[PDB]
Amino acid sequence: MEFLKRSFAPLTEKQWQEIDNRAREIFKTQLYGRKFVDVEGPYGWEYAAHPLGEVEVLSDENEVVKWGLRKSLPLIELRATFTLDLWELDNLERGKPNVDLSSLEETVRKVAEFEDEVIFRGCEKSGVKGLLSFEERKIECGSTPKDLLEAIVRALSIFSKDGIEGPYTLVINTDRWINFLKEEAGKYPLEKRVEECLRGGKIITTPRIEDALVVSERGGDFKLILGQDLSIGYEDREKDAVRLFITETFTFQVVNPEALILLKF
Amino acid sequence: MEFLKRSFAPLTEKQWQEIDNRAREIFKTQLYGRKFVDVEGPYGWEYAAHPLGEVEVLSDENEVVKWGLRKSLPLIELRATFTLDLWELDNLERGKPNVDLSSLEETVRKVAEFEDEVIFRGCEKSGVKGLLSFEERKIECGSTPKDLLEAIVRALSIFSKDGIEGPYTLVINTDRWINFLKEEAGKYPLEKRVEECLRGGKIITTPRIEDALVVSERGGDFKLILGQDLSIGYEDREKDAVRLFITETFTFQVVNPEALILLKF
Amino acid sequence: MEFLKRSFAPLTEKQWQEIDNRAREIFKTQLYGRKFVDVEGPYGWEYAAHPLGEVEVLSDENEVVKWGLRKSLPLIELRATFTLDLWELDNLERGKPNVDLSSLEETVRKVAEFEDEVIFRGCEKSGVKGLLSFEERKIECGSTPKDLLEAIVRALSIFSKDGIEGPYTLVINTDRWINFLKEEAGKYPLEKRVEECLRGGKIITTPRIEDALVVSERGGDFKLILGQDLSIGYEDREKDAVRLFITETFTFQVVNPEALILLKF
Ligand SMILES: Cc1cc2nc3c(=O)[nH]c(=O)nc-3n(C[C@H](O)[C@H](O)[C@H](O)CO)c2cc1C
Ligand SMILES: Cc1cc2nc3c(=O)[nH]c(=O)nc-3n(C[C@H](O)[C@H](O)[C@H](O)CO)c2cc1C
Ligand SMILES: Cc1cc2nc3c(=O)[nH]c(=O)nc-3n(C[C@H](O)[C@H](O)[C@H](O)CO)c2cc1C
């Protein structure tokens, strides 16, 4: 990847490795969307659009030759920059085990948050529709631990009436889960009951939403399309610091809206 | 090519061959643009857009993460229909050499004219710019046969001052050429003089323009991009007739505007 | 060639190739002197002077030991600089076919003009004498197309009286050639007559002179001596631009002044 001009920066191999290994760890645990969707393999740094499969007509009614245009989806590209310090970085060659790298982490968190916002709520100027926008898949619930177990059993019937099968998964907030655990105290464990009602499912707690939703994981309903994965590169040299950046290119879409249910409580 | 539903029409092999061979001949001689441009090979019935290689910025000035969208060109698709007669078509099996096929020819001519209009004058709603739009490549001429020979020699100097080489070609109207031939009568032939001033070039007469232009043919300056070539297919059956159609998908662009000169007289 | 510090510039192989290929084309057609002289092979970046073969005496008349110094010609070295833009250059990796490179071309033209001026008119401070300085090889002509054909036939006799043979070539201005072509209109072609009078020669039109001259091309009368050919290198990096330069080292001389005739009209 020669468009990332790495070999013109005054660093060594050990310093490059130390920089990469720290960002990999945080990206592993802070990307919540990539836990239950599909990913389509990289195409390259020159890919530009993804086809939809239709045509719109722009000619009159009485003409002999008739014509129109094809339709597609554009990709999104991002870039974010930060700085580091050379004397502090150079203590690694004298044998120091712990070095200060706070700016890197602070930037990584914001990039992850930006990426999740599009999957959960969509983008207006690009023509993307998110999960929380389908308002014909909502059902009502209550505020006691009993209504949750009622609602799961009600949802599985609607799933069966449409032909959808496979393992099922629950995605829920964190404070509500803690409140439920506090309210149910001194009795049979609640995780066991929930997994038995799901018939061998899973629970995922996140701070990105405000209520709960239920999905199926047979495969082929939510797609994320990548051109280039997340990468780090070099920009310029200041008086006694260096400047680096992070980049990526992507888009997202939803195919079958019948494998998703929203709970309101 | 199974999207052209040919095998559901009540015809035989000889009738299909007779229909194809007549259209090929007229398409060979009525497509004037394809004589001096480049053609990029077919990509398929699902190709949708062609990339340009840029990005436009849509974020604010003070933000930490910045983003934009990629850019491309959409393709154009066309379709035209006509009808034929079964009893008249069926005399071919009794041994008749000449059959009436006038509607086919009348439709082929209009399709060819539509295709040439875009190359010579562009399309507003698709973002295409044509040859006659570059107004900084014009020079002046006169109305006598002497000024043409002066203008060619003047143009070759401007060609040499930019680094452009290769064989050269002249494209001119028809009535003006006939008038020049009438005005020069009883002297040395004019084609020989013109080709000697071009230093071994060629002359092309067409009814599509109104003046003359000079181009170079080294290769790599005018591109035509095809998805699917021109094809014939079947639609439905009327009381005692049949209905067929013609289709294609394409786009066009100009790379180096320095291999083109326009003459005004 | 390691004195051209190329590998310290933030560019890639494709960008270097794109920069070289454009300058080669313009240098090919804008160097007019190198069409009918001889070139002596490169000697290196350390060559400094070329010997003439004489000695001048600096001692008195009555002395017992007598001495002097040898004589030679010094070489000329040049350098010219320009700047380019990084974001615009970086669109080549996204797939763009046409990039802006105007400063390079504007500098190349001036370097070519500087080089031709020395061959055609000489240098005072270096001790070089040019072609248009030999005033004992001039003959007179007129302003009609007939006098040119008379003058060529007169010149070949003077050539034969000295022992000079070989193919012959005519070098002439451009506006005068166009005026001659306009004045001779409607008759036998003029290029054929001129080449027949030259007995199988060639014609070269240039904007560098004001009249015509006739030369012979048997070999060994006009020499151009090179130390290093034309080259491109890297200087420094500005805020968001880069700085590059062009260099060369040469000299020139005339051996036999009897293979050259000047026409005045
Ligand atoms: C013993 C010593 C070691 C130093 N080591 C480094 C170093 O590894 N990196 C660095 O950037 N500056 C270092 N400096 C400081 C450097 O000489 C200077 O302060 C700045 O590089 C420019 O003023 C060092 C200074 C001293 C006295
Ligand atoms: C001797 C004869 C031959 C015919 N051949 C054809 C034929 O080849 N194709 C056809 O469409 N109709 C043909 N017809 C006409 C057909 O029977 C009828 O007019 C229409 O097909 C429906 O009314 C023929 C009629 C006759 C009397
Ligand atoms: C999406 C995006 C892509 C960019 N690409 C480049 C680039 O390829 N080269 C460049 O010099 N600057 C680029 N810049 C601008 C760069 O971040 C910044 O403007 C200057 O490099 C220093 O301010 C880009 C900016 C954005 C937002």
Curated annotation (Swiss-Prot), chains A, B, C:
Entry keyword Acetylation: no
Biotech exploitation of the protein: Foreign proteins can be targeted to ectopic nanocompartments in E.coli upon coexpression with a construct using the 15 C-terminal residues of Flp (AC Q9WZP3), tested with GFP. There are at most 20 GFP per compartment. Empty nanocompartments can be disassembled by extreme pH or by 7 M guanidine hydrochloride (GuHCl); only reassembly from GuHCl-dissociated compartments allows incorporation of targeted cargo.
The EC number(s) this enzyme carries: 3.4.-.-
Residues binding FMN, per UniProt: 79-81, 87, 90-94, 235
One of the protein's GO biological processes: iron ion transport
One MF term in the entry's GO annotations: peptidase activity
UniProt keyword Transport, yes or no: yes
InterPro entries according to UniProt: ENCAP, Encapsulin_nc
Location of the region described as Pore-forming loop in the Swiss-Prot/TrEMBL record: 184-189
Regulation of this protein's activity per its record: Proteolysis activated by calcium and cobalt.
Co-factor binding comment: A flavin ligand is bound near the 3-fold axis channel; FMN is consistent with the observed density, absorbance data and mass spectrometry.
GO cellular component, one term: encapsulin nanocompartment
Localization: Encapsulin nanocompartment
Gene3D superfamilies, per the entry: 3.30.2400.30, hypothetical protein PF0899 domain
NCBIfam families documented for this protein: encap_f1 (NF041155)
UniProt cross-references to PANTHER family, sorted A to Z: PEPTIDASE U56 FAMILY, TYPE 1 ENCAPSULIN SHELL PROTEIN
Domain notes: Has 3 domains; a discontinuous peripheral domain (P, 13-39, 76-133, 221-254), an elongated loop (E, 53-73) and the discontinuous axial domain (A, 137-216 and 259-263). The E-loop forms contacts between two subunits, while the A domain mediates contacts in the 5-fold interface. Pores are formed by residues 184-189, pore size can be modified by mutagenesis.
Family of this protein: Belongs to the encapsulin family. Family 1 subfamily.
Extra remark beyond the main annotation: Shows substantial structural similarity to gp5 of the HK97 viral capsid; while the sequence homology is weak, it suggests this protein may have evolved from a viral capsid protein.
Name of this chain's protein: Type 1 encapsulin shell protein
Encoding gene per record: enc
